[PDB]
């Protein structure tokens, strides 16, 4: 009882009190007197679980409010009563209230010439504003409102929903009627942002989510009837004639995070859940006829359907392991039997697109093709017709179509002119071609790639070529002057005749050797296409790897130990902390592209890359593509991506090397001989790297758009349903309901925690959020002091 209400008081002080005295200081007395109301208030009974003290409380703060409001502008700074919120470039009439200045022009000018609120005329016109007086006033009030929600919603965060018990009844039905306003004028039925206060308020309907993360920590089984009332009021007078997937998606969400969260933080192992889940499924009636005339979906209902993602996502995760590898543990190939049981006498079809949309993210593409074979026994997780509709020719994605529509023209030329042996096409689409002789040359090089060696890796296509369709490859590459330089053209010409090696790169995935053949590829064609300044270190690493022994790899431990000084990649340790100065996307990337010139070099001549790399004998190209799976992992856990969404995050960086010929990245010598050239190396690519990182969130979207329409992998039914299409090609699967759509079953991003890092560090989690940032930084090394008592 006591610390509850010592607590409760330390929230006060620590949100309101202290933040009047560092901002505001002419309510200090003001609110060390609201600290002994409070107290007084709490002393009867600090129980906020129940509903008379959090009433109290409430209370108390409303007068606190409207005391301060009293005490800046001369009894009662209100909301504009047109717009019903803070007055923006504030005018005040004679009859002391005080509007917006865009509301009073769009209301006074016709033939009512008054007040809407008191009735009383204004004489001349609205001409002078206030932005002394009104608009402090309104400013400082904003602040000391802000204030006090910080410390309500702390309040509630904390005191309301602290233990296992869920509290009262009254307590949770006064906070559902708070997130909604009262109507005072026709617009009514607002919403507003947990807060015992009533100016502060949006125009649109906007949902949050505040109370479903904190009523959910309970049980489901006990807050089933508040989450339905709180849902069936927003059903009745926000979103009655609305889209309700988006409401409906987020209450899905919501739902599964809670079993994430009573799952994790839950004592429990895998064999009781998988247990649990398929007792679920192997009951589970459909009932769709029940809860759809259109607009019945209920809380019950979204359940099930969160409870149905969360089978089908351990499916996922059991199916992406039993491909990589051996035998499935017995309890995980039981479930997945379950898992099938499910999907077959459950007739809809929407669970299997999810579940391919899950194994797409997870993995890729072409992993989810690979099951979509003749006898594969993970081909039930298909839809009924994308089997069926599948050709013998399934394509990879052209991750090159980063670049985009002048590569398009490119490789399509290229593509017709080894389809017939008829080479002037090619020099049609480059002469039609802006974006200069570099950019046009890495064009021809990557269409090259794409259309001669893509033959060469499948059984069909090689040794096809050879019969009098690379004589007219070999005499444009011959000819053409776009290429008119002879590390060029000799890289030109081993694509074509297939003796570059890097194609024979040797892994054992077959998925992962085509990711790496391709980034390989395009790190050459930028090395040797782009004429910069910060190319010349990685260019040595491929094109001459003997200038580059004794001499600093960036991302490399400093203290000093010059050239590759990482171990095994197949180790046991914490995940390699950032650089001096770096975030660790940028340091993953700037490693990763080492790694990727480092693996070019090495497959040329593998004894310079010997005698960089520190510790083996044995050889450089495993061991340099080990370190660039172990890179492209953590990649994908700090970007909150898919696989081939970060694959083209990769191909994207690669491609922005090549248009940035501005020169300002002088001082440091193209060797590395140094620690300070090596230093300058890391400024001046974080720079880079910073520069695709801010842009990337629109990039990506057209990118997906570029690759998605390539009309090699469109008409493929994988791709449509994945990647931006409904699978309602699929005729089989129900109707055109609220809840059956396809953005209810899409895949959306487990939250990890490096994610949160990646988000702390482009939100300047340094001068934010330090702690945090301290802690995220740390957090790896840190997991360890737990183990400093046994030691
Ligand atoms: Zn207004
Ligand atoms: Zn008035």
Known sequence: ALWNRIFSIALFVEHVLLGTESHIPELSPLVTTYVSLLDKCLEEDSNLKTCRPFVAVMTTLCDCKDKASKKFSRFGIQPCFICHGDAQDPVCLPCDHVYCLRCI?????????????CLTDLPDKFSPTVSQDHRKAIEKHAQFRHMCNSFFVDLVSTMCFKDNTPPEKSVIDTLLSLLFVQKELLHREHTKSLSPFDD???????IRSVLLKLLLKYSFHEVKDYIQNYLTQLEKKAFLTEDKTELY???????????????????????????????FLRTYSPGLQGQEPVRIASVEYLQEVARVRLCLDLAADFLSELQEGSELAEDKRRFLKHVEEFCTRVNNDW???????????????????????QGHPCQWVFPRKVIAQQKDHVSLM???????????????????????????????????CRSPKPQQTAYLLLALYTEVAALYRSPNGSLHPE??????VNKFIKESKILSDPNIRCFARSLVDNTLPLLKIRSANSILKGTVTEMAVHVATILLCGHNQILKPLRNLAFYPVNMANAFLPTMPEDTQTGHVLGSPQSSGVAEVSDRGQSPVVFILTRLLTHLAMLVGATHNPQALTVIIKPWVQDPQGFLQQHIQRDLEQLTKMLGRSADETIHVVHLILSSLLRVQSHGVLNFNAELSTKGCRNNWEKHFETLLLRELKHLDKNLPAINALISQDERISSNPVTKIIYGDPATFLPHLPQKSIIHCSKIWSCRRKITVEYLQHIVEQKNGKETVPVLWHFLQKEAELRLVKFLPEI
């Open 398 to 432: 052209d991750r090159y179509l980063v670049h985009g529509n002048e590569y398009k023209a490119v490789r399509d030329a290229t593509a017709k002119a080894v389809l017939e042996c008829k080479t002037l096409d090619i020099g049609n689409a480059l002469m039609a």
């Open 249 to 279: 998606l987020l209450f899905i969400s919501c739902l599964e995070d809670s079993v994430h969260q009573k799952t994790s933080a839950g004592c429990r192992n895998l064999e009781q859940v998988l247990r649990e889940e398929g007792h």
């Open 200 to 206: 502060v308020v949006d125009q649109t309907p906007v």
């Open 467 to 472: 019969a009098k369709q690379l004589e007219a």
């Open 105 to 117: 022009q769009t209301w006074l000018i016709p033939g009512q010439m008054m007040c809407p609120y």
């Open 351 to 373: 669970h299997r697109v999810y579940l391919v949309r899950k194994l797409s993210s997870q993995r890729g593409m072409e992993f989810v093709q690979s099951f979509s074979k």
